[PDB]
Amino acid sequence: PELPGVTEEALRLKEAALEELAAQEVTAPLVPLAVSAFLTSRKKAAAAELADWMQSPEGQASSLESIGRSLSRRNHGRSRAVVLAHDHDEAIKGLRAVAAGKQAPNVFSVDGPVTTGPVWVLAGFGAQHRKMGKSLYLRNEVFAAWIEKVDALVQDELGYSVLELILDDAQDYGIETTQVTIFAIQIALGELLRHHGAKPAAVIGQLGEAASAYFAGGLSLRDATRAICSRSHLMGEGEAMLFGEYIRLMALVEYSADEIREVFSDFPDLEVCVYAAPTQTVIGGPPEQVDAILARAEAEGKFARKFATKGASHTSQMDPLLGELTAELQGIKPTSPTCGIFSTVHEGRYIKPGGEPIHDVEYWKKGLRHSVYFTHGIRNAVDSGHTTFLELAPNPVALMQVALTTADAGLHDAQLIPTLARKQDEVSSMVSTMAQLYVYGHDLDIRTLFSRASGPQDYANIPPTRFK
Numbered sequence: 266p267e268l269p270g271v272t273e274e275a276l277r278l279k280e281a282a283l284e285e286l287a288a289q290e291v292t293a294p295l296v297p298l299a300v301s302a303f304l305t306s307r308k309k310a311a312a313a314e315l316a317d318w319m320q321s322p323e324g325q326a327s328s329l330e331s332i333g334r335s336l337s338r339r340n341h342g343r344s345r346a347v348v349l350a351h352d353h354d355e356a357i358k359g360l361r362a363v364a365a366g367k368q369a370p371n372v373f374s375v376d377g378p379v380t381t382g383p384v385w386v387l388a389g390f391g392a393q394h395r396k397m398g399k400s401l402y403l404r405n406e407v408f409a410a411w412i413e414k415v416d417a418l419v420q421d422e423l424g425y426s427v428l429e430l431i432l433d434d435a436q437d438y439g440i441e442t443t444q445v446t447i448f449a450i451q452i453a454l455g456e457l458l459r460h461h462g463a464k465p466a467a468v469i470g471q472l473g474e475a476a477s478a479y480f481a482g483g484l485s486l487r488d489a490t491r492a493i494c495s496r497s498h499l500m501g502e503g504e505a506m507l508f509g510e511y512i513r514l515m516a517l518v519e520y521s522a523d524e525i526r527e528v529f530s531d532f533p534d535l536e537v538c539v540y541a542a543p544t545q546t547v548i549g550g551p552p553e554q555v556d557a558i559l560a561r562a563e564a565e566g567k568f569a570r571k572f573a574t575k576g577a578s579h580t581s582q583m584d585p586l587l588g589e590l591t592a593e594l595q596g597i598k599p600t601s602p603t604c605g606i607f608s609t610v611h612e613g614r615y616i617k618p619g620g621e622p623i624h625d626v627e628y629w630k631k632g633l634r635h636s637v638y639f640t641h642g643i644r645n646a647v648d649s650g651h652t653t654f655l656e657l658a659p660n661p662v663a664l665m666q667v668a669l670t671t672a673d674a675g676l677h678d679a680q681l682i683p684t685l686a687r688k689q690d691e692v693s694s695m696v697s698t699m700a701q702l703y704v705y706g707h708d709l710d711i712r713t714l715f716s717r718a719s720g721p722q723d724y725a726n727i728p729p730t731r732f733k
């Protein structure tokens with residue numbers, strides 16, 4: 266079984282993307298400067314001493330990258346900080362805040378490690394944008410390798426290339442391609458994180474469920490790819506054949522689950538697609554009923570947003586698809602998860618590492634057909650000690666929902682770590698992500714954020730690489 270390679274057209278598009286890339290104003294890269302100590306008091310002094318030095322002409326003459334590399338080789342203590350800086354001025358200002366115990370947008374500082382490992386959040390719909398993943402694909406060999414990996418599997422399964430979609434600026438995403446391309450971006454972002462030493466304590470999903478199965482060791486990459494391919498082409502083909510009274514809209518309204526139970530007595534065909542947050546629910550059903558609940562919400566001063574789809578996932582309109590989905594997913598091999606799963610399919614309940622497999626065919630049918638218990642899964646994570654939530658996405662849509670649920674459960678302090686975002690540099694974003702994992706004491710080998718020194722100019726004249 267030999268997989269499709271990268272397509273001619275993908276190679277052509279890459280050649281063009283690389284030329285366009287080579288001819289742009291080069292930006293200062295974002296460099297992470299880590300400082301740590303057993304005591305916060307010492308960390309703060311270390312930050313101040315580093316600043317003083319970076320102000321000196323010898324400091325000024327050393328590159329941020331050589332300083333960060335040197336800093337990366339120190340003992341990483343329990344009290345930690347990172348200044349994300351593009352130049353010496355930014356680094357110093359940030360180091361000053363660290364020392365002063367003050368805060369600033371490019372600075373993370375904490376007295377000790379968070380107690381529990383991070384929850385990886387794999388959402389999806391709403392996160393897509395035309396150029397998503399393109400810049401990181403061109404600029405990161407590891408990310409690129411994983412995108413190409415998923416690209417082969419998706420070619421093999423559906424007969425087109427997601428890499429073509431990523432590189433081609435004229436192409437935009439639909440119900441089908443959004444799913445498989447975000448999947449690809451999710452897989453590649455996570456493997457990139459794993460490459461730098463990170464891992465999930467648990468996963469939660471809102472597709473994102475396919476990727477979450479992969480990263481939880483519930484399915485092989487192949488089987489996760491089948492899960493997303495099968496689901497996505499069926500939904501895209503179904504939604505395109507929908508016109509008139511067949512249409513079913515989806516919309517976001519500021520009603521709690523309890524509110525919805527009362528409100529729905531007036532709207533007999535509405536269903537819940539997603540419990541997104543304590544007072545935010547995605548509802549679905551016939552257009553006249555969706556507009557009426559929207560109107561009722563707007564009149565009560567509650568937020569309400571109609572989505573763009575002629576179809577309603579997680580409603581009864583999915584019934585015709587379940588047959589095909591069943592047939593198509595026959596053969597998949599559900600495995601025992603290797604990290605925890607908050608399953609938004611199974612009402613937000615938790616499956617332990619080593620537990621029984623969950624990711625059988627019936628799970629994907631159940632998932633497509635029934636409500637997504639997102640806020641419930643998040644609430645269950647908070648209540649079991651989790652404070653770090655890290656969203657693998659092209660745009661951080663789900664973190665805004667996560668914050669509502671964490672706040673509502675009495676966690677005012679949560680560590681909400683995004684990955685990529687539109688109109689934010691993708692390499693910078695990932696530096697920031699990995700910086701933050703480091704500062705909170707999660708697994709992250711900060712040494713791997715710099716290339717191996719080839720000479721002494723790759724170090725700065727500070728401990729532990731002082732020039733004898």
Ligand SMILES: [Cl-]
Nearest residue numbers: 339340341729
């Ligand atoms: Cl040290």
Ligand SMILES: [Cl-]
Nearest residue numbers: 339340341342
């Ligand atoms: Cl260390």
Ligand SMILES: [Cl-]
Nearest residue numbers: 302303342343
């Ligand atoms: Cl320590």
Ligand SMILES: [Cl-]
Nearest residue numbers: 372373374375
């Ligand atoms: Cl902080």
Ligand SMILES: [Cl-]
Nearest residue numbers: 404405406407
């Ligand atoms: Cl690279």
Ligand SMILES: [Cl-]
Nearest residue numbers: 614615645648
């Ligand atoms: Cl519970």
Ligand SMILES: [Cl-]
Nearest residue numbers: 675676677678
């Ligand atoms: Cl708190």
Ligand SMILES: [Cl-]
Nearest residue numbers: 679680681682
């Ligand atoms: Cl945060």
Ligand SMILES: [Cl-]
Nearest residue numbers: 715716717718
């Ligand atoms: Cl290297």
